[PDB]
Write a protein that holds these residues in place. Sequence first.
Motif, PDB file in Angstrom:
ATOM      1  N   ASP A   1      -1.747   2.221 -75.706  1.00 46.75           N
ATOM      2  CA  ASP A   1      -2.917   1.935 -76.529  1.00 46.75           C
ATOM      3  C   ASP A   1      -3.149   3.122 -77.452  1.00 46.75           C
ATOM      4  N   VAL A   2      -3.017   2.897 -78.754  1.00 46.59           N
ATOM      5  CA  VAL A   2      -3.105   3.949 -79.758  1.00 46.59           C
ATOM      6  C   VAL A   2      -4.290   3.721 -80.698  1.00 46.59           C
ATOM      7  N   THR A   3      -5.292   2.963 -80.253  1.00 42.65           N
ATOM      8  CA  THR A   3      -6.514   2.811 -81.033  1.00 42.65           C
ATOM      9  C   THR A   3      -7.203   4.158 -81.277  1.00 42.65           C
ATOM     10  N   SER A   4      -7.045   5.120 -80.364  1.00 44.01           N
ATOM     11  CA  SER A   4      -7.669   6.456 -80.455  1.00 44.01           C
ATOM     12  C   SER A   4      -9.186   6.355 -80.490  1.00 44.01           C
TER      13      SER A   4
ATOM     14  N   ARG B   1      -0.891   8.752 -71.643  1.00 43.99           N
ATOM     15  CA  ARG B   1      -1.486   7.497 -71.108  1.00 43.99           C
ATOM     16  C   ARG B   1      -0.650   6.320 -71.601  1.00 43.99           C
ATOM     17  N   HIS B   2      -0.013   5.606 -70.684  1.00 41.79           N
ATOM     18  CA  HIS B   2       0.899   4.550 -71.073  1.00 41.79           C
ATOM     19  C   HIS B   2       1.060   3.586 -69.912  1.00 41.79           C
ATOM     20  N   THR B   3       1.610   2.424 -70.225  1.00 43.34           N
ATOM     21  CA  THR B   3       1.897   1.402 -69.244  1.00 43.34           C
ATOM     22  C   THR B   3       3.361   0.996 -69.363  1.00 43.34           C
ATOM     23  N   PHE B   4       3.838   0.291 -68.345  1.00 43.31           N
ATOM     24  CA  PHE B   4       5.252  -0.009 -68.208  1.00 43.31           C
ATOM     25  C   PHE B   4       5.434  -1.421 -67.674  1.00 43.31           C
ATOM     26  N   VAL B   5       6.408  -2.150 -68.242  1.00 43.41           N
ATOM     27  CA  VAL B   5       6.765  -3.495 -67.788  1.00 43.41           C
ATOM     28  C   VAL B   5       8.280  -3.630 -67.782  1.00 43.41           C
ATOM     29  N   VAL B   6       8.752  -4.667 -67.091  1.00 43.33           N
ATOM     30  CA  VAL B   6      10.162  -5.039 -67.068  1.00 43.33           C
ATOM     31  C   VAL B   6      10.262  -6.521 -67.374  1.00 43.33           C
ATOM     32  N   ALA B   7      11.041  -6.875 -68.397  1.00 41.72           N
ATOM     33  CA  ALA B   7      11.385  -8.268 -68.661  1.00 41.72           C
ATOM     34  C   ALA B   7      12.771  -8.603 -68.108  1.00 41.72           C
ATOM     35  N   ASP B   8      12.929  -9.839 -67.656  1.00 46.11           N
ATOM     36  CA  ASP B   8      14.218 -10.301 -67.154  1.00 46.11           C
ATOM     37  C   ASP B   8      14.989 -10.946 -68.299  1.00 46.11           C
ATOM     38  N   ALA B   9      16.052 -10.289 -68.752  1.00 39.90           N
ATOM     39  CA  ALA B   9      16.829 -10.809 -69.869  1.00 39.90           C
ATOM     40  C   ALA B   9      17.862 -11.839 -69.436  1.00 39.90           C
ATOM     41  N   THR B  10      18.049 -12.028 -68.131  1.00 40.09           N
ATOM     42  CA  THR B  10      18.903 -13.107 -67.671  1.00 40.09           C
ATOM     43  C   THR B  10      18.273 -14.470 -67.904  1.00 40.09           C
ATOM     44  N   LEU B  11      16.943 -14.539 -67.968  1.00 39.79           N
ATOM     45  CA  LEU B  11      16.213 -15.752 -68.313  1.00 39.79           C
ATOM     46  C   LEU B  11      15.990 -15.814 -69.821  1.00 39.79           C
ATOM     47  N   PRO B  12      16.106 -17.005 -70.425  1.00 41.71           N
ATOM     48  CA  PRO B  12      16.295 -17.067 -71.890  1.00 41.71           C
ATOM     49  C   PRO B  12      15.138 -16.520 -72.722  1.00 41.71           C
TER      50      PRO B  12
END
Length: 107
Positions: A104-107, A1-12
Amino acid sequence: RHTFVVADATLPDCPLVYASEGFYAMTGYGPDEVLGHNCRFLQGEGTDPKEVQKIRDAIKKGEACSVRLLNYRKDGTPFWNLLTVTPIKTPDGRVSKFVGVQVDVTS
Ligand SMILES: *[C@@]12=NC3=[C]C([C])=C([C])[C]=C3N([C][C]([O])[C]([O])[C]([O])[C]OP([O])([O])=O)C1=NC(=O)[N]C2=O
């Protein structure tokens, strides 16, 4: 069970540009409040500053990083976020995006 995101590193300040459906469902925030923003809005009173520092440094270095952070849902309730950030570089070596797996690792 997990989630995924993408950050834009071209923006500071590494704004999030994509989140999986689970990231919204887990945090309580919608895209109108997530996209365009730095992930640190999930942090709060109990977030260990020494672990926040490990991620800031790895991002400034374009290094991968795995830290465990105390985060807060939109309704204010806390949860334990095992977070792993991976840099994605162009062939010329520049970092273009950071990708995050959050559990989330609260368990
Ligand atoms: C957040 N996930 C997350 C995912 C990615 C891909 C990246 C690049 C960062 C995060 N962060 C943290 C935030 O953006 C920042 O990197 C750190 O707080 C360190 O920099 P500052 O300026 O704050 O010292 C995530 N932070 C969270 O709290 N929860 C996540 O899910």
